[PDB]
Amino acid sequence: RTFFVGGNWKANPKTVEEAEKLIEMLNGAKVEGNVEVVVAAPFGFLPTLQQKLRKDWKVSAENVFTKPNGAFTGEVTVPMIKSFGIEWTILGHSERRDILKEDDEFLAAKAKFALENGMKIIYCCGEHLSEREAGKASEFVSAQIEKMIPAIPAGKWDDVVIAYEPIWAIGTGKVASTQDAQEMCKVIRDILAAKVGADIANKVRILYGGSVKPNNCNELAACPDVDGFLVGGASLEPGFINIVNSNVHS
Amino acid sequence: RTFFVGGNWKANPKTVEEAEKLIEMLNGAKVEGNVEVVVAAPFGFLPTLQQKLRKDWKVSAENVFTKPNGAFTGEVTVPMIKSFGIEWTILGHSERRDILKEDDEFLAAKAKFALENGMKIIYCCGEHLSEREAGKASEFVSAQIEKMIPAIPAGKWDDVVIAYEPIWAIGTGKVASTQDAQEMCKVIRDILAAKVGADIANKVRILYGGSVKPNNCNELAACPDVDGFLVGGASLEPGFINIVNSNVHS
Ligand code: NA
Ligand code: NA
Ligand code: NA
Ligand code: NA
Fold it and tell me: Fewer CB within 10 A of the terminal residue: chain A, N end or C end?
C-alpha cells in the first residue's frame, strides 16, 4: 500500500494570491521516499491549483454534490470538477457532517455517484466524544462503514481511501494518542475484511485524520495500519513536507 | 430604481468549456435600455467568469459561508470571492433553504458578514405551498424579512437586493400569475417601509424569482413593484437577453 498524504486546506487561505504563494512553496518541496500526495482546496482556488500545482501531486475537491448538474444553487458537482482534470474529492469530513449537517444517506449517494463517475474519494468517518467515552467507538465506526460499503461499485475499491477522524478529540478538551490512531485504523481494516474481504482490506489506504503535525507525523506513520494522513492546519504550513516525508517511517 | 436582472446558472453548466461558450454568447448580447446585470455561477467557474465576462456586467457567487476562513471543509468564503474582484453573492435561495437546510439565523449571519465585508447581496425569500393556500403569504414573508432587517448595517441598504421566490409554485403543480408577482413584491416593499422607512423601501430593488422566460418577462417587468428578476433556467439560454431587455417595459 503506497503511503497517502492528503493536505486539506479546508476553508483557507483567504485569497487567490495566498493560494498561489502556497502552491509555489509546495512546488519546491523535496519529497523523500514513496508517497501519494493529494491537495484539497476551496472550490474557487481549484482551477488555479490544477494549473500550477506540481504534476506528480494531485488536486482534490473538499466536497461535491450528489447530482451531475441542476437546480442546486450554491452546489458544485463532479462533472464541473472533472472538467478541470480534477480526479479527487473529499467526502464526509466531520465539519460537513456537523456544521453543514450531512447525514450518512447523503454521503452514501455522494460516494456512489463520484465513483460511478470516475472520481477517487477520501471518505471520512469517526466517532464523537460520547461513543468514545462509552467504549463504543468500534460500533459507531462500523455503522458509518456499513453505510459506505454498498456505495462502492465493483472494481472501485482501488479508488477509495478512508480517513479516520477522532472527532471526540476536536474541540472537546481531550487529546488522541498515537496508540488511539493505530487502534481505530485497525478497527476500520478489520471491518473491511469481515464485510468485503481480506484482499480489499489489505489494499485500502486507511488514513489518520486527527491532529497531524511535524512533531507527531513520524510516530503516527510507523503504526502498521496507518497508511497516511488527512492533514488539517499543517497543510497551510511548511511542515506539510515533513508530513509527506513521514512515509519513510511506514 | 435601476432595473436589475440576475442570471442564476445554479449548478450549471457541467463543464468549464460550456461556461466559456456561454460567456462568449453573453459577451455578444446587445443590451437595450438601462439595466444592472449580474451573473451567478458555480464556485469553480467564478474565476473564468470574472476574467472573461463583459465588464459592464457583474459576477455573483451563488452562496458564501458566514466566516472569513477556517475549519469549514467544503465551504467558500467572502474573502476568497472578493480576492477575485467579485462583488456579489446570492443568499437564501429556496434550494439552499430546502435541500441544504439553511435556516433564517444562518442566512442572517451570512448577510451581516457579507455586507460588513463590502459585498452586495441578493437575498431571497418566499413562502411555501401551505402558507400560500392558507392565505398567510404576507405573514410568512414578513417573518423572513424581519429576520433579515437587523443584519443590514447602516448605509448598506444601497447594497441590498431582495428576490421573491414563489416556492409554492416550484414542483407543486401550481403556477404563479403575473398578478401574484406584483402582489408579493408590493408586500415586501410595504414591509420595508413599515419597518425601516419609505426612503429605503423606495430604493430597494425587489425582484421576482419565479419562472421567468422570454414569453413572460415583459408583462412581469411592467408591474410597478417588480424591479427585475432572479432568472433560473433562462440564464443558460439565449432568451436571457430578452429578459435583461425587458427593462424597457418597467
Ligand atoms: Na478500478
Ligand atoms: Na504506517
Ligand atoms: Na452604502
Ligand atoms: Na417594473
Answer: N
